[PDB]
Design a protein around this ligand. Structure first.
Ligand SMILES: Cc1ncsc1-c1ccc(CNC(=O)[C@@H]2C[C@@H](O)CN2C(=O)[C@@H](NC(=O)C2(F)CC2)C(C)(C)C)c(OCCc2ccc(CN3CCN(c4cc(-c5ccccc5O)nnc4N)CC3)cc2)c1
Lengths: 104, 88, 115, 149
């Protein structure tokens, strides 16, 4: 029933949870509470694909098998600036060092 | 619904529910204010820490069988140091 | 002190080897656990409850040394072993069930060897 | 006779051991002197109907590392008498480990005990890595908790 997500934009990551039954619009409403941008200033994505407001999270492909507490599914986020949405841009996390010789 | 922001050494911002961040004894102490900067914890480690917070809250005292918390060998040492510093 | 006739010793051994070698439908040798008793140091609770302890090792030794004077004497020690295993472990245990199959195996081998 | 041990009840009890963890499970039986006895292991996702007795005490560990496991959401399992035949269920699972303990498990699984002090980490963590999961330590911890209550 529950889906666990990372809503990412540039250097920002929101860790949140929702139901498989909740809509993409309800998710935009969670973001609005946190980042103070209304849903109409938001574009949500799954693997560079635009998510429709009326669709449930389950219908988008976010399930208890793909969106886990220990391994959350990533949702992309693009904001609207001067009536134009920016290109979807997600900054990668830092890279770990090369595995030590004793760990091989 | 209270949220807190956790900033990594490389400037990534992680927004987690307050109750989930209180899993860490160090964070709980620093919030005893809803923003904490970690000048020595990189984003690839901090994101993994936030995933532990979700895992812990969801599975502590659950009746649904508990999955393993997975850790890649390449992040194991830095993740150990952060868990030790964060008291979680 | 005088030994048993060789025919009687041969009969006693042929029966006991049929009991010891017996395997169920799954290929499991049922006598396995009953070959040797655990020691008093290992399982003192067995010795607290079981007055006349015996295993298939002490049984084979008793044939070899002519302690059993008839097939009936051999039977009393095999039934004793199984009843000891039943009393200690109680109903619902696999060892209890295995000891009941071995009782039946002994009596059928003794009937076959004496025909 | 210690606090944590089995009672020689001689009262039969049918139990189902069910490994619902991703680990190979070591069932551990505490004898009549409270000494731990290793029992045949259970591969992940397997169940066996076993015979035990009323008032007998069980613990469950990872067979290879001896990391502690849960049984019906607790540490110790004691079967009571079966009510009208009914076997008693023992559902074995992973606990929620601390992030530190889980990190220690992973680093111990990759590095040999001799090379722990060759790791580029906070020096306090060497003693943490050396302090391996131990059944006896946990039994002392559980006994101390029992006397406290
Ligand atoms: C499959 C599987 N997968 C995962 S776990 C598992 C599994 C689970 C259960 C068992 C068998 N059950 C038990 O051992 C239960 C459990 C606990 O309550 C204690 N206990 C008992 O029987 C004790 N009994 C008692 O408290 C009482 F009987 C007094 C009531 C005890 C230990 C015998 C004192 C098993 O078994 C297979 C593995 C397993 C377990 C234990 C042992 C060591 N044995 C101990 C003594 N034993 C015996 C020999 C003879 C005997 C010998 C010669 C001649 C005549 C005889 O009657 N008689 N009875 C014995 N129990 C041989 C070696 C070996 C193998 C495997």
């Amino acid at each position: 029933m529950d889906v666990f997500l990372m809503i990412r934009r540039h250097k920002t990551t929101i860790f949140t949870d929702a139901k498989e039954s909740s809509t993409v619009f309800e998710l935009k409403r969670i973001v609005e509470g946190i980042l103070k941008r209304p849903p109409d200033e938001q574009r949500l994505y799954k693997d560079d694909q635009l998510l429709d407001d009326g669709k449930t999270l389950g219908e988008c492909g976010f399930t208890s098998q793909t969106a886990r507490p220990q391994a959350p599914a990533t949702v992309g986020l693009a904001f609207r600036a001067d009536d134009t949405f920016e290109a979807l841009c997600i900054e990668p996390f830092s890279s770990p060092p090369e595995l030590p010789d004793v760990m091989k | 619904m209270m949220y807190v922001k956790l900033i990594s050494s490389d400037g990534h911002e992680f927004i987690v529910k307050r109750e989930h961040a209180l899993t860490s004894g160090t964070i709980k102490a620093m919030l005893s204010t809803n923003e904490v900067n970690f000048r020595e914890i990189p984003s690839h480690v901090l994101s993994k820490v936030c995933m532990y917070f979700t895992y812990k809250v969801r599975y502590t005292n659950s009746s649904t069988e508990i999955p393993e918390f997975p850790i890649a060998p390449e992040i194991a040492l830095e993740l150990l140091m952060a868990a030790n510093f964060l008291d979680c | 002190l005088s030994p048993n006739p060789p025919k009687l010793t041969k009969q006693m051994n042929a029966i006991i080897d049929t009991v010891i070698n017996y395997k169920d439908s799954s290929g499991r040798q049922l006598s396995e656990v009953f070959i040797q008793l655990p020691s008093r140091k290992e399982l003192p609770e067995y010795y607290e409850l079981i007055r006349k302890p015996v295993d298939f090792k002490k049984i084979k030794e008793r044939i070899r040394n002519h302690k059993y004077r008839s097939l009936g004497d051999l039977e009393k020690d095999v039934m004793l072993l199984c009843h000891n295993a039943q009393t200690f472990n109680l109903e619902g245990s696999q060892i209890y069930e295995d000891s009941i199959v071995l009782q039946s195996v002994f009596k059928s081998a003794r009937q076959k060897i004496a025909k | 006779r210690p606090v944590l041990r089995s009672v020689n009840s001689r009262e039969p009890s049918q139990v189902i051991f069910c490994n619902r963890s991703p680990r190979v499970v070591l069932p551990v039986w505490l004898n009549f002197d409270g000494e731990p006895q290793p029992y045949p292991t259970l591969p992940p996702g397997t169940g066996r109907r076993i015979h035990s007795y009323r008032g007998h005490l069980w613990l469950f560990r990872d067979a290879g590392t001896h990391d502690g496991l849960l049984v019906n959401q607790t540490e110790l399992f004691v079967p009571s008498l079966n009510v009208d035949g009914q076997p008693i269920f023992a559902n074995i699972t992973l606990p929620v480990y601390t992030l530190k303990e889980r990190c220690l498990q992973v680093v111990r699984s990759l590095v040999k005990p001799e090379n722990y002090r060759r790791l580029d980490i906070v020096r306090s963590l060497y003693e943490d890595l050396e302090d391996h999961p131990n059944v006896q330590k946990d039994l002392e911890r559980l006994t101390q908790e029992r006397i406290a209550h």
